[PDB]
Amino acid sequence: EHLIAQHSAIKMLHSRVKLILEYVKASEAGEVPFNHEILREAYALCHCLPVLSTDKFKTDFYDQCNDVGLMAYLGTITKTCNTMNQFVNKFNVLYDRQ
Amino acid sequence: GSMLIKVKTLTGKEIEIDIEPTDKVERIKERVEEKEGIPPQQQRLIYSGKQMNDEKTAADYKIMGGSVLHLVLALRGG
Amino acid sequence: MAGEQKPSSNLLEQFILLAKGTSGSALTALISQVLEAPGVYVFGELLELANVQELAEGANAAYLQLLNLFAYGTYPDYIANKESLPELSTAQQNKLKHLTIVSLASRMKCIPYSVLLKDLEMRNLRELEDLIIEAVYTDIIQGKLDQRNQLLEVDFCIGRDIRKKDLSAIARTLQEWCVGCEVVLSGIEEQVSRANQHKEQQLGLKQQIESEVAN
Amino acid sequence: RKYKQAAKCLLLASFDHCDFPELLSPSNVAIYGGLCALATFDRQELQRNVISSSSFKLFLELEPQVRDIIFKFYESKYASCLKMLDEMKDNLLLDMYLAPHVRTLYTQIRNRALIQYFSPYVSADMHRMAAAFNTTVAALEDELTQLILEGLISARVDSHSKILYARDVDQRSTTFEKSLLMGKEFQRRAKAMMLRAAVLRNQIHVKSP
Amino acid sequence: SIDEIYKYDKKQQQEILAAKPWTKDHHYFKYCKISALALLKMVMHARSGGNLEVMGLMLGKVDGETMIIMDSFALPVEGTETRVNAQAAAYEYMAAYIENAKQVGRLENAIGWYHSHPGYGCWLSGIDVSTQMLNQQFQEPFVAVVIDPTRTISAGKVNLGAFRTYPKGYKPPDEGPSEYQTIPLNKIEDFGVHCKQYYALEVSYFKSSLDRKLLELLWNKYWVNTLSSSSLLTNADYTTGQVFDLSEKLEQSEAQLGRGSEDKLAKATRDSCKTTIEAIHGLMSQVIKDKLFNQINI
Ligand SMILES: [Zn+2]
Numbered sequence: 001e002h003l004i005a006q007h008s009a010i011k012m013l014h015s016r017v018k019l020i021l022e023y024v025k026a027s028e029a030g031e032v033p034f035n036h037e038i039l040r041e042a043y044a045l046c047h048c049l050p051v052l053s054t055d056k057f058k059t060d061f062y063d064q065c066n067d068v069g070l071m072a073y074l075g076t077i078t079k080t081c082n083t084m085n086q087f088v089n090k091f092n093v094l095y096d097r098q
Numbered sequence: 099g100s101m102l103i104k105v106k107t108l109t110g111k112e113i114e115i116d117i118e119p120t121d122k123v124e125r126i127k128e129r130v131e132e133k134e135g136i137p138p139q140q141q142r143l144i145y146s147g148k149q150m151n152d153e154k155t156a157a158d159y160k161i162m163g164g165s166v167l168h169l170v171l172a173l174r175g176g
Numbered sequence: 177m178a179g180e181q182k183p184s185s186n187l188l189e190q191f192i193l194l195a196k197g198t199s200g201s202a203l204t205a206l207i208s209q210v211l212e213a214p215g216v217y218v219f220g221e222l223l224e225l226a227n228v229q230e231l232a233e234g235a236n237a238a239y240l241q242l243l244n245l246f247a248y249g250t251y252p253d254y255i256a257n258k259e260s261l262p263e264l265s266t267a268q269q270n271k272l273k274h275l276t277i278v279s280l281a282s283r284m285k286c287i288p289y290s291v292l293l294k295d296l297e298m299r300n301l302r303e304l305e306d307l308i309i310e311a312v313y314t315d316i317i318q319g320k321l322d323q324r325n326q327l328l329e330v331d332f333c334i335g336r337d338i339r340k341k342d343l344s345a346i347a348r349t350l351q352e353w354c355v356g357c358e359v360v361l362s363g364i365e366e367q368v369s370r371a372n373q374h375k376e377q378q379l380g381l382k383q384q385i386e387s388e389v390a391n
Numbered sequence: 392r393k394y395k396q397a398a399k400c401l402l403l404a405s406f407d408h409c410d411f412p413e414l415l416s417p418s419n420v421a422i423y424g425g426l427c428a429l430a431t432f433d434r435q436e437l438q439r440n441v442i443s444s445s446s447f448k449l450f451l452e453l454e455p456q457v458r459d460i461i462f463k464f465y466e467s468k469y470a471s472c473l474k475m476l477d478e479m480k481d482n483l484l485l486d487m488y489l490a491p492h493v494r495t496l497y498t499q500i501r502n503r504a505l506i507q508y509f510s511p512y513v514s515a516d517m518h519r520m521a522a523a524f525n526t527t528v529a530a531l532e533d534e535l536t537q538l539i540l541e542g543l544i545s546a547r548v549d550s551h552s553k554i555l556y557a558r559d560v561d562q563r564s565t566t567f568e569k570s571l572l573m574g575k576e577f578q579r580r581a582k583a584m585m586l587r588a589a590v591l592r593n594q595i596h597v598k599s600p
Numbered sequence: 601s602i603d604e605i606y607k608y609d610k611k612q613q614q615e616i617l618a619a620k621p622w623t624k625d626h627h628y629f630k631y632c633k634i635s636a637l638a639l640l641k642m643v644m645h646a647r648s649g650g651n652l653e654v655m656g657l658m659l660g661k662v663d664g665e666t667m668i669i670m671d672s673f674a675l676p677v678e679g680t681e682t683r684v685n686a687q688a689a690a691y692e693y694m695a696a697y698i699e700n701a702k703q704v705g706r707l708e709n710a711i712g713w714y715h716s717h718p719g720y721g722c723w724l725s726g727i728d729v730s731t732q733m734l735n736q737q738f739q740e741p742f743v744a745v746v747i748d749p750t751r752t753i754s755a756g757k758v759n760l761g762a763f764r765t766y767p768k769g770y771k772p773p774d775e776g777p778s779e780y781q782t783i784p785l786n787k788i789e790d791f792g793v794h795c796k797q798y799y800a801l802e803v804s805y806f807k808s809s810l811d812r813k814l815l816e817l818l819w820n821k822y823w824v825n826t827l828s829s830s831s832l833l834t835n836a837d838y839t840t841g842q843v844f845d846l847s848e849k850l851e852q853s854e855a856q857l858g859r860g861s862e863d864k865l866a867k868a869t870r871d872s873c874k875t876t877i878e879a880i881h882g883l884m885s886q887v888i889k890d891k892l893f894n895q896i897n898i
Contacts, residue, residue, distance in 0.1 A: 012819070071880060120734065
């Protein structure tokens with residue numbers, strides 16, 4: 001229910017840059033205007049490829065995911081500890097007088 | 099609103115409003131701003147030279163129909 | 177006249193009517209005033225006119241060489257091909273340097289300093305970053321000086337030239353990679369329509385089990 | 392030995408009581424109090440307690456010795472400071488009541504001498520510094536080795552440096568390692584308790600014979 | 601028709617308004633047909649309200665066995681969650697609005713109470729339970745329309761509950777939801793005093809086909825925004841407050857299960873798993889963008 005907003009906006013601009021793609025392909029194909037400002041931007045794009053190779057964000061994202069993952073680790077804690085407390089309850093229920 | 103009181107600006111703008119005998123002036127402020135764009139936090143409700151607590155009932159100060167809830171309030175809303 | 181990324185806006189109908197009416201040596205003067213047009217160093221639809229076609233392969237066949245250099249070649253081509261092309265000004269020689277260098281930064285995230293020092297014949301730091309800062313000062317270059325990497329940080333590149341045509345292959349390679357990342361992400365999409373849709377089904381059924389556990 | 396409130400009162404010296412022969416000699420009064428403090432304190436409030444001491448100022452002005460002792464101590468002339476330190480070694484011994492904690496005192500004294508100078512640096516050079524503390528190079532570094540036994544800086548020494556480098560940098564990755572240690576013992580306990588549910592609910596125990 | 605429910609039959613609507621089925625059974629209203637104005641400024645004016653509690657008049661109607669929230673939202677005010685009958689004071693809003701709303705064919709009349717507890721809900725607390733109970737003996741059909749702004753921030757779902765509280769004399773029958781909710785110290789005692797004096801309405805939503813097309817087309821260019829969130833940076837501090845709060849709740853679960861708020865250990869395990877899921881899904885979206893745009897190699 002979140003990523004479908006992603007999907008919707010991406011599909012909208014997808015229609016945009018796909019109409020772009022279509023009249024583009026026609027440029028090199030034929031009967032549609034020959035301009036030098038078509039792909040050229042595509043070259044800019046292919047040098048816009050994966051931003052920050054940098055190892056900077058590489059460490060940064062080690063940071064991020066380690067944070068959330070140890071969060072989840074603690075939550076391996078939360079889940080099984082709640083399970084454990086209920087177990088000790090029922091152990092104090094039938095094995096014992098809670 | 100069972101209590102029909104007046105919220106009055108510094109210039110004398112007494113506004114007729116339906117409230118209750120325990121209606122919070124906290125929400126009476128909400129009423130004055132939802133009615134007149136002038137927001138209530140410079141609609142400083144003062145009662146007889148002494149401020150009315152923004153978190154109180156109008157009737158807490160024996161406020162009634164022709165009673166006055168002071169603004170001092172703003173001009174851009176109005 | 178028209179306006180987006182380009183040289184001095186006069187140039188389009190400027191050199192249209194020039195090549196139309198100025199030819200031979202008048203065509204050479206045409207070309208000489210063409211020479212300073214940075215963002216259009218290539219004249220695909222401007223060599224569309226037969227006046228530029230005779231500009232090309234006429235007296236100024238070397239100039240069509242230079243034009244294709246703008247389209248295809250580099251300044252270090254001229255560093256080798258010092259005689260093939262027509263004359264150029266030191267400003268315009270540095271302009272062809274900027275040709276190859278904007279093409280390079282177009283290639284890399286950040287081109288090394290020594291890269292353009294050597295291919296563009298650049299000797300030392302001073303003149304190097306002089307032409308560098310003037311390139312960025314053209315606003316073609318975003319990013320900053322990538323000194324630590326001995327590069328030039330690049331965040332944005334305005335189009336250098338019209339750069340006669342890998343155009344078909346260019347746009348179709350674009351279509352290729354666009355669809356490739358698209359299909360990667362779409363396989364992800366349906367893995368999502370699996371997993372936490374599977375999460376919906378799994379927990380719904382598990383909760384059904386837990387509810388039926390009672391009675 | 393809860394000398395915190397001890398010095399809390401020691402600072403509280405009010406001269407205007409002015410007389411009790413069994414109370415304390417003002418020499419012993421000030422030395423006693425202020426050195427309980429000089430054990431207890433953290434430097435800031437104590438300089439406040441010391442440099443901004445007013446009620447104790449007579450008591451302050453009693454021993455010029457111990458006065459400038461702790462003065463240039465916090466100013467760190469460790470050499471002669473420690474000098475008169477373990478010179479009044481014998482006379483605190485000469486105190487019936489300074490004797491019973493001489494080891495405690497001199498202990499925490501040279502401890503906090505460390506604590507004082509060492510804190511700003513990044514790599515503990517020793518050579519001139521040892522010339523100051525007047526501990527032999529080995530005795531110096533073994534003081535340090537002691538320090539290793541408890542010390543706070545992730546520090547190591549080229550002995551041929553004759554010089555420490557102090558504590559390290561990262562705490563994040565430190566958190567990482569403690570995190571994983573955490574998780575491993577977590578899973579360990581977890582299986583343990585799984586098997587424990589088994590042994591219990593499988594009736595399991597051990598009879599007496 | 602999809603527009604068949606957008607039809608505000610002022611005839612029919614105000615008919616059931618004067619119908620008084622609640623005085624026959626105070627459990628008649630089971631549904632709450634809503635137009636998304638509630639969500640609209642309820643959401644963004646609880647959020648834009650910061651943490652300042654608010655109050656006032658909702659637009660709406662009634663249909664069959666259904667309360668209908670055409671409107672609900674917030675004030676730029678405070679004091680709600682502790683005001684003696686807060687909401688009243690903002691009704692001046694549609695003391696005017698609805699009136700000349702009729703001048704455009706909005707012949708509706710006032711129906712309810714807009715409000716928001718920015719950060720911690722939209723409801724009526726202890727003093728506002730005086731508010732809620734008194735007014736439902738004042739103003740029935742009256743509702744405790746309940747949705748939490750920051751809960752709907754870190755939750756991804758609108759927990760809407762139209763809480764017709766059980767009036768004095770009328771106890772929760774078979775169907776009293778009584779949505780138990782973690783309350784601050786100010787009103788948790790009075791919630792325990794009044795947690796089981798309200799039921800929820802079956803809050804449905806009604807719209808037009810143009811509405812669906814508009815939301816889809818919204819997404820159809822918002823997806824670019826979708827891959828530009830950076831919200832792990834947003835409320836990591838919020839995660840930290842949950843850190844403290846959760847260690848505290850485990851402290852209190854400790855204190856409860858020691859010798860002998862019901863089973864704070866299990867509730868705490870639940871909420872811990874919940875909030876960790878929250879932070880983890882934030883990290884999910886962020887790592888999503890990251891790995892996507894950073895695995896784009898030339
Ligand atoms: Zn109230």
